[model samples]
Target chain A: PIIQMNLLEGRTVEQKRNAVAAITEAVVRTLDVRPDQVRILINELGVEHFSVAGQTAAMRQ
Target chain B: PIIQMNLLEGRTVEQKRNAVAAITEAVVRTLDVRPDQVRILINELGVEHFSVAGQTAAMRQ
Candidate 1:
């Protein structure tokens, strides 16, 4: 299984690392897959690059 | 649109940077979206963390 997490930029590497580890654990437990089968990709976006409800993250902020 | 790329780990930061740039450009050209509208997430896997045809990448190597 694969997971793609989209997050706002500026998080420390440590936080990202922890998040992936936790996500991996959850997927493995829920999907009954080996730890090896869980794949996670983290995408970090600048506020200007993401939008919602027709408003950019930067604009909302 | 979103593109999720699964890659082997150990890529240099420069390679990753260039890859995302090229991917974003391609998505923009093909999908007719602005640069900011293209989202690409890269998943880097260790040899042990990926498998195909019932064999892990680490086993194949």
Candidate 2:
């Protein structure tokens, strides 16, 4: 089975870098998978990208 | 060429929906490709799953 998750936050570039590295580890150790077999992608989307059901992401927020 | 990207965040279900839309648009506009031809996958990792280079992710921070 393939496990996946996502999150939104505000942090410095250093935080972003750390986040990717940490998540990659968990996937491998817990799943007993190889580093190369794991995949990680992070997007720093600003307010412009936020939206809600059929509307702006953060609009309903 | 295939352009792929990822992000880890704390967003509502709605936000996830929009993020994918925006990314699809950018990819299509820049690469001048069709929407159906593009593929996107988002993963949301919890704290327990986060890590850093050879260490927990937030640690390198």
Candidate 3:
């Protein structure tokens, strides 16, 4: 069975796009894996579900 | 309009949580993206769906 890919991080939209490309190439070159065999999912986050150094917005603010 | 976020990786729960928080703040400070307006979706993947370099954990073992 093929594999699913997911990457999460705080980066600019442009950076995110580049990252996906880099990761995809790495997978293909390193594993001899096909492009179709890989499925990559990307996500971004805000404050509600995240915090800085364990401090939420309320805590940080 | 704001953006939706998703991150997938092999990390402990604590690391995942910390990453989310750090990214959220970066969005706000760097892009002036509002804390509330940001949407972060986190997905934790098992070894089955992800791998390091070119080999899965199972394959590596």
Interface RMSD for each predicted structure: 7.3, 7.1, 8.6
Best model per DockQ:
2
DockQ category of candidate 2: incorrect
Provide per-model DockQ scores.
Answer: 0.10, 0.10, 0.03
Q: Which sequence of candidate numbers ranks them by DockQ, best first?
A: 2, 1, 3
Q: Choose the strongest candidate by TM-score.
A: 1
Expressed as tens digits, the lDDT of each residue in A1-61 for candidate 3 is 2334433344555554455556767778888877556555543344455576887554565
What is the DockQ score of candidate 3, to 2 decimals? 0.03
User: How does model 2 do on interface RMSD, in angstroms?
Assistant: 7.1
Better of 2 and 3 by DockQ: 2
For model 3 chain B, the run of ten residues with the poorest summed lDDT: B46-55
How many clashes in each structure?
Answer: 0, 30, 10
Maximum-lDDT candidate: 1
lDDT of 3 at A36: 54
Candidate 3's error at A61, in angstroms? 52
What are the lDDT scores of the predictions, listed in order? 0.74, 0.58, 0.55
lDDT per residue for candidate 2 within B10-54, as digits (tens), equals 679898879788888988999899999888866565433443333
Q: Give the Å shift of residue A13 in candidate 1.
A: 0.6
Off by over 4 Å in 2: A1-61, B1-6, B53-61
Q: Is candidate 1 or candidate 2 better by TM-score?
A: 1
Instruction: Please provide the root mean square deviation of candidate 3 (C-alpha atoms, Å).
Output: 15.4
Better of 2 and 3 by lDDT: 2
